Structure 1
Amino acid sequence: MDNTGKLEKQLVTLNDGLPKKPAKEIIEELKHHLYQDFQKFFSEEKKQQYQNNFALFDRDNDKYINLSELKELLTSVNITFPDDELEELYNEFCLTSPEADGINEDAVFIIVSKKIRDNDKDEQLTQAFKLVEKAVNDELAKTPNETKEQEGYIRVEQFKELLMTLGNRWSEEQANEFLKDINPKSDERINYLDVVKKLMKR
């Protein structure tokens, strides 16, 4: 009795059974998970087109194309990477397949996966700005005594719970940083347009 103590540390230990399967099978299943998103991200036309821009640079028919051949495939498909990003992507697959003289057909497909997957993330994030501005303007028109300057300006209470709807959940904890990062200037209002710029720039 007497409530003698105490603050005790119930240390949350990350011992939740790291994948007991061998690293090889871990790799195959991770690859399958990556390819599954590929399947929907790219129409069958895109899939059966990337070979029509992979092989001729894969002149040797070994199913492996160097970084230059990968970039040529990208240019032919009208999808372009920055030099550094494309080189990194090609070299990562070359390392993961040391017995491969570059990036294989699957490697090129995955590189396009990353490209148009970043593009789709940006497009969803952008379409988010459209609904955000729609709601901001509608609520501002619901308050006719508030100047149009607020178009773009939005409250802290007008900027949080939109993190429960679309894409891949930014929870409430994933609703925190941007505030500190962009410094609401003692007003707790930060332009959703400024958030458009920053989130499109990341």
Structure 2
Amino acid sequence: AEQLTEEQIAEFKEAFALFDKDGDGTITTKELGTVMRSLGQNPTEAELQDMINEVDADGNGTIDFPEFLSLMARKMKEQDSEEELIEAFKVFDRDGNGLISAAELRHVMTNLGEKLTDDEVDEMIREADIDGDGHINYEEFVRMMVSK
């Protein structure tokens, strides 16, 4: 009773069409290459082959539209969970400097209904901190959120 509407499919065909320059229904390493170069990156042939191999489920050396539909689904699913984590990081990082301090984390925990001492909060930071600055940056934040 669901998965994809005609309209989503139509928009996924538009995207496929940008890459499939000659309209044969497949994207080759060299078509991938033409699109990347247009975006200011010039990958070597070996780099292009690793990107296709990643996506090529049947091993025929090219990406058809079912294969691109699979890819696009995994990717946007992933882009959603990254949006969530970036959003939760910017509410904690009250001054926007890239780093959650102990004062910032304690203030947000109190608005979440948890009145924590500075010792409690220092312990929370200490478990998550990797570079030893006593702040949580985004990388340390994601590594804690995805599992301790």
TM-score by length of 1: 0.40
Higher radius of gyration, 1 or 2: 1
The structure with the greater share of residues assigned to helix is: 2
